Amino acid sequence: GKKVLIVYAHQEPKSFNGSLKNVAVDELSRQGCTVTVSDLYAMNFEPRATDKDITGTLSNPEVFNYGVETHEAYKQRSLASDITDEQKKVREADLVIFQFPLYWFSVPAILKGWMDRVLCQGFAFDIPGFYDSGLLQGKLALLSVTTGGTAEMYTKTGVNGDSRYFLWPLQHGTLHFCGFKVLAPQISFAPEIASEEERKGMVAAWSQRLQTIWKEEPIPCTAHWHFGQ
Amino acid sequence: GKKVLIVYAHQEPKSFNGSLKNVAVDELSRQGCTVTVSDLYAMNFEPRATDKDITGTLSNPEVFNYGVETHEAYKQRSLASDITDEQKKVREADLVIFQFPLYWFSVPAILKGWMDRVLCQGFAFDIPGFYDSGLLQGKLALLSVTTGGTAEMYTKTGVNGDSRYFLWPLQHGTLHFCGFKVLAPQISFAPEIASEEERKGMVAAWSQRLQTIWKEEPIPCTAHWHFGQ
Ligand SMILES: [Zn+2]
Ligand SMILES: [Zn+2]
DSSP track, chain B: --EEEEEE--S-TTSHHHHHHHHHHHHHHHTT-EEEEEETTTTT------GGGB-S--S-TTS--HHHHHHHHHHHT-B-HHHHHHHHHHHH-SEEEEEEE-BTTB--HHHHHHHHHHS-BTTTB-SS--GGG-TTTT-EEEEEEEESS-GGGGSTTSTT--HHHHHHHHIIIIIITTT-EEPPPEEEE-GGGS-HHHHHHHHHHHHHHHHTGGG------SHHHHH--
Chain A from 109 to 138: CB within 8 A of any B CB: 109-110, 112-113, 115-117, 119, 127, 130-131
Q: Answer yes or no: are the C-beta atoms of A188 and A206 closer than 8 Å.
A: yes
Which residue in B51, B64, B112 is closest to A109 by CB distance? Answer: B112
Ligand 1 centre distance from Cα of residue A175 (Å) = 8
- For B7, other C-beta atoms within 10 Å of its C-beta total 27
The reply to whether residue A223 touches residue B159, judged by beta carbons under 8 angstroms, is: no
Chain B residues inside the 8 Å CB shell of A174: 104-105
Distance CA B63, CA B60 (A): 6
Ligand 2 centre distance from Cα of residue A154 (Å) = 14
Which residues have C-beta within 8 Å of that of residue B14, sequence separation ≥ 6?
Answer: A62, A63
Distance CA B191, CA A204 (A): 49
Distance CA B184, CA B34 (A): 22
Does B225 contact chain A (CB < 8 Å)?
A: no
Which residues have C-beta within 8 Å of that of residue A177, sequence separation ≥ 6?
Answer: A125, A130, A131, A134, B104
Residue B169 one-letter amino acid: P
Residue A221 one-letter amino acid: C
Does A43 contact chain B (CB < 8 Å)?
A: no
Chain A residues inside the 8 Å CB shell of B14: 62-63
Residue A160 is assigned to a ligand binding site: no
End-to-end CA distance of chain B: 40
Q: Is B1 exposed, middle or buried (0-12, 13-18, 19+ CB in 10 A)?
A: exposed
Ligand 2 centre distance from Cα of residue A183 (Å) = 28
Minimal-distance CA residue of chain B relative to A222: B161
**Elucidated via:** X-ray
- Which residues on neighbouring strands pair with residue B183, listed in sequence order? none
Ligand 1 centre distance from Cα of residue A132 (Å) = 10
Chain A residues inside the 8 Å CB shell of B165: 168, 223, 226-227
Distance CA A114, CA B108 (A): 11
Does B12 contact chain A (CB < 8 Å)?
A: yes
Distance CA B40, CA B9 (A): 6
Chain A residues inside the 8 Å CB shell of B41: 48, 50
Ligand nearest to the CA of B105: 1
Length of chain B: 229
Whole-Å CA distances, A45 to A82, A117, A207: 8, 10, 27
Chain A residues inside the 8 Å CB shell of B177: 104
CA atoms in the 13 A half-sphere facing the CB of B90: 24
- In chain B, residues preceding a discontinuity (C to N beyond 2.5 A) are none
The reply to whether residue B11 touches residue A159, judged by beta carbons under 8 angstroms, is: no
Which residue in B44, B48, B174 is closest to A105 by CB distance? Answer: B174
CATH number for the region B1-229 comes to 3.40.50.360
The reply to whether residue B14 touches residue A63, judged by beta carbons under 8 angstroms, is: yes
- For B20, other C-beta atoms within 10 Å of its C-beta total 25
Distance CA A185, CA A183 (A): 6
**Cα B227 vs. chain centroid, distance in angstroms?**
21
Chain B residues inside the 8 Å CB shell of A169: 104-106, 166, 169
Ligand 1 centre distance from Cα of residue B169 (Å) = 17
Whole-Å CA distances, A199 to A20, A148, A153, A220, B74: 10, 14, 19, 29, 29
Does A199 contact chain B (CB < 8 Å)?
A: no
User: Resolution, rounded to a tenth of an Å?
Assistant: 1.4
Cis before residue A229, ω within 30 degrees of 0?
yes
Which residue in A11, A105, A177 is closest to B50 by CB distance? Answer: A11
- For B225, other C-beta atoms within 10 Å of its C-beta total 15
Distance CA B186, CA B31 (A): 20
Chain A residues inside the 8 Å CB shell of B109: 47-49, 109-110, 112-113, 115-117
The reply to whether residue A41 touches residue B62, judged by beta carbons under 8 angstroms, is: no
Does B35 contact chain A (CB < 8 Å)?
A: no
The reply to whether residue B47 touches residue A47, judged by beta carbons under 8 angstroms, is: yes
- Which residues on neighbouring strands pair with residue A34, listed in sequence order? A3
Residue A106 one-letter amino acid: S
